[model samples]
Target: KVFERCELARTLKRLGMDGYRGISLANWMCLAKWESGYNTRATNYNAGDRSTDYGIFQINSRYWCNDGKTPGAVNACHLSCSALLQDNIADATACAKRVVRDPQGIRAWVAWRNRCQNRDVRQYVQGCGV
Candidate 1:
């Protein structure tokens, strides 16, 4: 499923991600924009790492998720990696909350590293009144 920017911001707010997780809402929106453009079924196989990146958050199979074939995956959120590749974002948001607690914080997402970090994401949610 795909969501418009305003709708996504509202979803994040409704999920308490609008600053409840030690992250700014704009940053979340920015990451969401770059990560999957708010597409719930987004997925990609990183052949270089032999693992699939899943969902809007692109939770990885290396540590935070498991796609079965991924060797020694930690599945830190205690869920099937495919769980991230869905319309409902509850599990994905929950797992993402867990992911941000790590050293990288939101940078666990490469999109954030290259695009959102230290950037002016405030504009990401412009006109949304989020």
Candidate 2:
């Protein structure tokens, strides 16, 4: 799963934030790992309602699913990973690139990591100069 997710990160690097801003592949990959553990089929379980947050990125059904009409849409409190698989990866990469370009370096990634109690990912990237 991690390797497969790296493919998406590489694709994002190639895209280079043409439409959106651009972010570093390392920073974007860090966010993806933090968000979804690189699991395309990963989901978040909302225990209160016994509902699942669907897809690789844990896109909430309430926000991402168009009333369950779309592929990966939440239906019967479940969603498929396909909905957020490629498109989300692309968008996330673009967004990260944009943020990095705007601020330079992985400032946003660092901030996000701090919020997630994951300052280590940023340190790793810095050590590698990624």
Candidate 3:
């Protein structure tokens, strides 16, 4: 599912992402924009650790979800990587919350740092009425 900017904003807001772990909805929007372009089935394979990033938030299998192929990977979210690929996004949203619970917070996603951190992200939700 490839989402429009405002559609995803409202959805994330409804999912409680607006202030989840001190991160704002716009920031989450920014992350999704850069990470997966709002596409739920997006996937990126990392050859470095033989891990894969899955879904809209690009949650990685190396530490978050289990793909059963990444070497020595930890399933911190206790979810199968396949769950993140679903268009419904409920499971992916839950895993994203778990990710920010760590010491790194929203910095768990590098795209957020590179594209959204300290930047004017309000545009992501500018007209969404979120």
Sort every candidate by lDDT, greatest first: 3, 1, 2
Winner by lDDT:
3
Clashes of each: 0, 5, 0
Cα error, candidate 3, residue 113 (Å): 0.8
TM-scores of all models? 0.93, 0.47, 0.98
How do the residues 13-73 of candidate 3 rate in per-residue lDDT, one tens digit apiece?
Answer: 8888999989999999999999999999999999877999999999999899999999999
CA lDDT scores, all candidates in order:
0.84, 0.47, 0.94
Kindly indicate the candidate among 1 and 3 with the higher TM-score: 3
In angstroms, the error of model 1 at 71 is 1.4
For model 1, state the Cα shift of residue 127 in Å: 2.0
Worst 10 residues of 3 by lDDT: 121-130
Best by TM-score: 3
Query: What TM-score does structure 2 among the candidates reach?
Result: 0.47
Better of 2 and 3 by lDDT: 3
User: lDDT by residue for model 2 over 8-69, one digit each (tens)?
Assistant: 55555566632344334455555556667766556676665544554444544543333343
User: Which residue pairs clash in candidate 1?
Assistant: none
Give the range where candidate 2 is weakest over 10 consecutive residues by summed lDDT.
72-81
Is candidate 1 or 2 superior in lDDT?
1
